[PDB]
């Protein structure tokens, strides 16, 4: 009976571990969430989460917190984007097993 946002809360510590996602993967995930329908992130949000000056882990933490707070649609789309751009990691998520 887990919702997509339940899954995301469950998966967040795993997803944010160093090495798990690369900058290229996180950047493409952000683009995926901004460039299509539904538009999960605004352009300004997308720029903030891609900002090369902040550590990837901090940006990723902040993105996942943002999606958790934004509801089921946003959490679901994150999982679709993760499948597209980081499939091996997507297959290993705690919430799958």
Swiss-Prot record:
Expressed in ovary, testis, placenta, skeletal muscle, kidney, lung, heart and liver (at protein level). Expressed in thymus and brain. Residues 6-97 form the CARD domain. Changing residue 63 to A: Abolishes the NF-kappa-B inhibitory activity. Disulfide bonds join 5-75. Plays a role in inhibiting the effects of BCL10-induced activation of NF-kappa-B. May inhibit the phosphorylation of BCL10 in a CARD-dependent manner. Associates with BCL10 by CARD-CARD interaction. This is Caspase recruitment domain-containing protein 19. It comes from Homo sapiens (Human). The gene is CARD19. The chain holds residues 3 to 99 of 228 of the full protein.
């Amino acid at each position: 009976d887990q919702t997509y946002c339940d899954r995301l809360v469950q998966d967040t510590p795993f997803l944010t571990g160093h090495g798990r996602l690369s900058e290229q993967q996180v950047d493409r995930i952000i683009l995926q969430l901004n460039r299509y329908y539904p538009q999960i992130l605004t352009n300004k949000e997308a720029e903030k989460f891609r900002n090369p000056k902040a550590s990837l882990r901090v940006r990723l933490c902040d993105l996942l917190s943002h999606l958790q707070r934004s509801g089921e649609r946003d959490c679901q789309e994150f999982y679709r984007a993760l499948y597209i751009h980081a499939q091996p990691l997507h297959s290993r998520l705690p919430s799958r097993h």
